[PDB]
Design a protein around this ligand. Structure first.
Ligand SMILES: [K+]
Ligand SMILES: [Mg+2]
Ligand SMILES: [Mg+2]
Ligand SMILES: [Mg+2]
Ligand SMILES: [Mg+2]
Ligand SMILES: [Mg+2]
Ligand SMILES: [Mg+2]
Ligand SMILES: [Mg+2]
Ligand SMILES: [Mg+2]
Ligand SMILES: [Mg+2]
Ligand SMILES: [Mg+2]
Ligand SMILES: [Mg+2]
Ligand SMILES: [Mg+2]
Ligand SMILES: [Mg+2]
Ligand SMILES: [Mg+2]
Ligand SMILES: [Mg+2]
Ligand SMILES: [Mg+2]
Ligand SMILES: [Mg+2]
Ligand SMILES: [Mg+2]
Ligand SMILES: [Mg+2]
Ligand SMILES: [Mg+2]
Ligand SMILES: [Mg+2]
Lengths: 129, 7, 224, 88
RNA sequence: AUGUUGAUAU
RNA sequence: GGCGUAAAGCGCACGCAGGCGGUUUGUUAAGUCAGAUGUGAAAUCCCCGGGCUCAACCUGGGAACUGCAUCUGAUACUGGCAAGCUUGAGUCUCGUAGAGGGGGGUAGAAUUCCAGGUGUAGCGGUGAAAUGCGUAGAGAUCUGGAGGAAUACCGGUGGCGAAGGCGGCCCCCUGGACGAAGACUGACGCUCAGGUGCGAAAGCGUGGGGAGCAAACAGGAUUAGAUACCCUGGUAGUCCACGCCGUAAACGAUGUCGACUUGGAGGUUGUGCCGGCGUGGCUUCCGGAGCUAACGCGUUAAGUCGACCGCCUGGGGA
């Protein structure tokens, strides 16, 4: 059964990028939208939009630069079978800081940069590079 | 056999 | 180029839908009678910027090479190339024409040697059969290497009818970083091609249109 | 399978409505009707192993719905197992 | 139809 | 780190414990995170110094001791509790195809045997033979009868089933799958160590049956031999009932569930709109990206991911 919707979102992006899809559409959720913001603000995706009430559908618009897809990699890190939580001092630098780790902190979802600045650790959702 | 060949 | 010319010429007609390349999905308008119709609204703009860069290469004294070995589109290609004062391959492309130019260069010199021998009257010296071999040897070298005999080196761009049929030429042109301009029909793969021109590669009327235009624009480049 | 009539009788008995086919009580009641009906079949047909795999699916499904109902509403569970006459 | 085998090291 | 072929997917399922868990709101603060305090002996290690002629060695101060506990906050995520929701899962209605299963009955073709007619010297068998059968009348041919087993054609890289498997026709009992319209329940789910069930063929037990076939066995050949292959016979067995066994190259040598990711040509089975145009299920072949040691796999993945289980760790010994 479906037991990790985040991994499913990351996979929809990963696959959609590989397939040169313009946009990818998943079922929405608060946490998915929260991640979509971080990917938007850091400039990995172009835009997103939720649509619907009973069954909302998130819809990420994907970026390509010089032909190539912008999301080089995108890896689930914390997963249901093994949760990863890091303290502020032990937050991961993805691709020597050129990529992001999306971190759920007590003050919401954010990059590991933003979490270092805010002085928070938390659950490491994914790496992006 | 032959108490041990190819000729 | 005009769009009324295209739909008159039959540039819109692709292959049967079963024979399509999925990578031509952007350029395909739809399907009529289980045959893909090429979107001419894509063709015309793409062909203009194709005709633009060919003119630009022509204006820089570039050697265009007109490749098209299909039976119908053979003599079209030679007429277009010679009218433009440019080079062509209108029969079987020799594998390694460009990538192995250093070798193929030598077979040019043979074609040059045999024709200089022919007009001198060197064939009268040898004993009939020996001359008839040389006649046949000249004939085969003319068919293969006739269009590029005076080319002198590697070309500055390829113009190609049918990107599938001439996949070897394109793969060589990619290898050497020579720009490829190519007519890419619905069955064909556009990925090697540097300037895709989505159009009917089969019909002579379509072929003459494209060739006439590139002949004109490159000739206009050589003028200015 | 259970007849259209016999199905509908159970829907009316156990449902909140005549159209309440989905309810846990109706589902469990329907399974119980067919499990009980098939006891006669398997008494005769002891080596009908292929059909019995269907019976044991009903038995399993019913166990899952009763374990659902019990933790959802202990009272509704206690009423249901009394009416249908189940140990648990 | 049938119709075996080829000493040791190199 | 692996498990199509190198070692590795349980034969297949159901399922308890366990692991994992769609979506919305509130609440809690266990996990998690933040801060503080106490503690983490000294030595050792590390850093900057000092002292023995140097060094080893000795030694000052730090850093470190990644830990533990307590208190106080944070509340995104995970967990708990409460209330929802319908998209996962399931129920109902109508229909469809099917060698799905169990039970009972029956039909026609053929083999063998039995009885009788006609008929006469061979038949049968093989590479060639011989054993064998035959004048006590075979073989062949015709009529009648008995009995068992299996269902030609249809028949199809067709269908159904969890797997093993399932094939004449008829009826009785019965399981699943699929589709179309809604309606209904409201996460009721996925996986599953141990457990339980099913599980080809051979085999075993008890009682039946026994045409054909055929381990063993016998004879005839072949051969250097021939405990074989070939031939003539032939018993268990193969068949039925009930019970047991629990294994197979039980194979796709590919665990189950879910999501996602260019195409082409079929097969089969629904269905909608009007021969065409869609839309579901299952399935065969090719092939793209990608993957792969390669072979190949390729939307039915061996691609891209998640959950849980099983299993592997050189060859042999085993
Ligand atoms: K010997
Ligand atoms: Mg049912
Ligand atoms: Mg030998
Ligand atoms: Mg290994
Ligand atoms: Mg092996
Ligand atoms: Mg193996
Ligand atoms: Mg298996
Ligand atoms: Mg199960
Ligand atoms: Mg959850
Ligand atoms: Mg706490
Ligand atoms: Mg000193
Ligand atoms: Mg010290
Ligand atoms: Mg200490
Ligand atoms: Mg919660
Ligand atoms: Mg087990
Ligand atoms: Mg048996
Ligand atoms: Mg027996
Ligand atoms: Mg017996
Ligand atoms: Mg025999
Ligand atoms: Mg085994
Ligand atoms: Mg296996
Ligand atoms: Mg393939």
């Amino acid at each position: 059964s479906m037991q990790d919707p985040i991994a499913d979102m990351l996979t929809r992006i990963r696959n959609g990028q590989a397939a040169n899809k313009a946009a990818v559409t998943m079922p929405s959720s608060k946490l998915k939208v929260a991640i979509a913001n971080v990917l938007k603000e850091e400039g990995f995706i172009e835009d997103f939009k939720v649509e619907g009430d009973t069954k909302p559908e998130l819809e990420l618009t994907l970026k390509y630069f010089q032909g190539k897809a912008v999301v080089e990699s995108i890896q689930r890190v914390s997963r249901p079978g093994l949760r990863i939580y890091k303290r502020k001092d032990e937050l991961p630098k993805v691709m020597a800081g050129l990529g992001i780790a999306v971190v759920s902190t007590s003050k919401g979802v954010m990059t590991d940069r933003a979490a270092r600045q805010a002085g928070l650790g938390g659950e490491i959702i994914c790496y992006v590079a | 056999x032959x108490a041990x060949x190819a000729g | 180029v005009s769009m009324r010319d295209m739909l008159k010429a039959g540039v819109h007609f692709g292959h049967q839908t079963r024979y399509w390349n999925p990578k031509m999905k952007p350029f395909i308008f739809g399907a009529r009678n289980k045959v893909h119709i090429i979107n001419l609204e894509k063709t015309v703009p793409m062909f203009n910027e194709a005709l633009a860069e060919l003119n630009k290469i022509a204006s820089r004294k570039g050697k265009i090479l007109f490749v098209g070995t299909k039976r119908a589109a053979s003599e079209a290609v030679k007429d277009a190339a010679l009218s433009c004062d440019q080079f062509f391959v209108n029969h079987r492309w020799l594998g390694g024409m460009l990538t192995n130019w250093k070798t193929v260069r030598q077979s040019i010199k043979r074609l040059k040697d045999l024709e200089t021998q022919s007009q001198d009257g060197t064939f009268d010296k040898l004993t009939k059969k020996e001359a008839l071999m040389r006649t046949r040897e000249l004939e085969k070298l003319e068919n293969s290497l006739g269009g590029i005999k005076d080319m002198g080196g590697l070309p500055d761009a390829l113009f190609v009818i049918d990107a599938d049929h001439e996949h070897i030429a394109i793969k060589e042109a990619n290898n050497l970083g020579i720009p490829v301009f190519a007519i890419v029909d619905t069955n064909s793969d556009p990925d090697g091609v540097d300037f895709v021109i989505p159009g009917n590669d089969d019909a002579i009327r379509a072929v003459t249109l494209y060739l006439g235009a590139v002949a004109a624009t490159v000739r206009e480049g050589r003028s200015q | 399978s259970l007849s259209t009539e016999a199905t509908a009788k159970i829907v009316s008995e156990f449902g909140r409505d005549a159209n309440d086919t989905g309810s846990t009580e109706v589902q469990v009641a329907l399974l119980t009707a067919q499990i009980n009906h098939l006891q006669g079949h398997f008494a005769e047909h002891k080596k009908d192993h292929h059909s019995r795999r269907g019976l044991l699916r009903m038995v399993s499904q019913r166990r899952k719905l009763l374990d659902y109902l019990k933790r959802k509403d202990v009272a509704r569970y206690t009423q249901l197992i009394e009416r249908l006459g189940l140990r648990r």
